[PDB]
Design a binder for this molecule. Structure first.
Ligand SMILES: CN(C)c1cnc(-c2cccc3ccccc23)c(-c2ccncc2)n1
Ligand SMILES: Fc1ccc(-c2n[nH]cc2-c2ccncc2)cc1
Ligand SMILES: Fc1ccc(-c2n[nH]cc2-c2ccncc2)cc1
Length: 337
């Protein structure tokens, strides 16, 4: 321990952090960890501190901890959560048991901003622009988010947005994921963005499926049952039988479904909510869409440094994942103040 730590209990959870962080107050808890807001005396910044839950209890948890830390250390973009700091009270690998992550405090999530109401067109343009700008970066690193939804989008009072954590998740999931296709691609994230954008425009969940089958049904109601070109790509005999046995439905007219919305917004929705993932617009392409003319800047939509996910295929011992994680804690270099 280079800095001096202090201990305290907050909601049954023990928090041991450096004295630079003051006035911890809980903001939320999950199965993966708990978060407190705090004041960083060194920078004058309000920060969020996340304490991971049982990070090395099993090989599974240990690998997930490593995965999360590696990802977070790599994400350096204005629209993606990143790290201000990472620390452990442990003085050596032997006593290493806890991991704390620090980032700039964000005020609320998009679900809170939606208030289940319609946002203005300018707000929809700026919020979706930011999601896509972050998604361009994430995708450029060969990372798929896979779980985009309003609760995973942090937003400040000035409408600044950051993507987090690479109500029901299924509502924003791509149809090919409902079908359990093993080879989905990055455009599953674009599907999610389309579902989010629709909700910001209408104030209603686009596809509020009660289960996976219902979710697919609702999707096909809007975009229609698969055409011949898409059917040819389905390997599963059972899946084809199921799909081809549904009463066929044509694609709805998006202009009528979203009547009143900016025609440019409607056009983009049409390009995002395409049933065949191979024909969906990419994040980079979407940024160039006329809907974002007021915000698009091709010279300020950066890509990420390459990201090595080779560790994902490795089968290591629990202490090996723990040691790799410890190395990542020790090697952390904070971003310039
Ligand atoms: C599920 N949600 C909404 C989460 C999850 N984790 C963190 C989080 C909280 C604290 C530190 C973090 C470090 C890296 C990545 C995420 C975090 C936050 C958070 C981040 C910034 N401000 C407020 C809250 N929200
Ligand atoms: F949403 C989904 C997800 C998967 C299936 C499925 N895949 N293979 C076979 C089927 C299926 C599901 C239900 N009834 C018959 C067949 C059908 C709908
Ligand atoms: F009903 C549907 C809904 C979506 C899909 C889908 N869209 N993009 C890719 C596919 C797909 C699904 C299953 N197997 C291969 C590809 C295919 C059938």
């Amino acid at each position: 321990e280079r800095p001096t730590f202090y201990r305290q209990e907050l909601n049954k959870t023990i928090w041991e952090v450096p004295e630079r962080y003051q006035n911890l107050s809980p903001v939320g808890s999950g199965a993966y960890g708990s978060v407190c807001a705090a004041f960083d005396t060194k920078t004058g910044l309000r920060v969020a501190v996340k304490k991971l839950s049982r990070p090395f209890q099993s090989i599974i948890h240990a690998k997930r901890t490593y995965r999360e830390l590696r990802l977070l250390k790599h994400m350096k973009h204005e629209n993606v959560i990143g790290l201000l700091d990472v620390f452990t009270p442990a003085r050596s690998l032997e006593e290493f048991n806890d991991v704390y992550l620090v980032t700039h405090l964000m005020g609320a999530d998009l679900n809170n901003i939606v208030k289940c109401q319609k946002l203005t067109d300018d707000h929809v343009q700026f919020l979706i622009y930011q999601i896509l700008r972050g998604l361009k970066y994430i995708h450029s690193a060969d990372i798929i988010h896979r779980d985009l939804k309003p609760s995973n989008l942090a937003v400040n009072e000035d409408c600044e947005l950051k993507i987090l954590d690479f109500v029901a998740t299924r509502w924003y999931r791509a149809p090919e994921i409902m079908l359990n296709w093993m080879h989905y691609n990055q455009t599953v994230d674009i599907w999610s963005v389309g579902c989010i954008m629709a909700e910001l425009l209408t104030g209603r969940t686009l596809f509020p499926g009660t289960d996976h089958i219902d979710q697919l049904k609702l999707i096909l109601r809007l975009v229609g049952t698969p055409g011949a070109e898409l059917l040819k790509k389905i390997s599963s005999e059972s899946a084809r039988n199921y799909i081809q046995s549904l009463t066929q439905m044509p694609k709805m007219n998006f202009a009528n479904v979203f009547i009143g919305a900016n025609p440019l917004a409607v056009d983009l929705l049409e390009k995002m909510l395409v049933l065949d993932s191979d024909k969906r617009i990419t994040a980079a392409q979407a940024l160039a869409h006329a809907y974002f003319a007021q915000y698009h800047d091709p010279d300020d939509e950066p890509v990420a440094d390459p990201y090595d996910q080779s560790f994902e295929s490795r089968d290591l011992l629990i202490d090996e994942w723990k040691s790799l994680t410890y190395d990542e804690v020790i090697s952390f270099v904070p971003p310039p103040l």
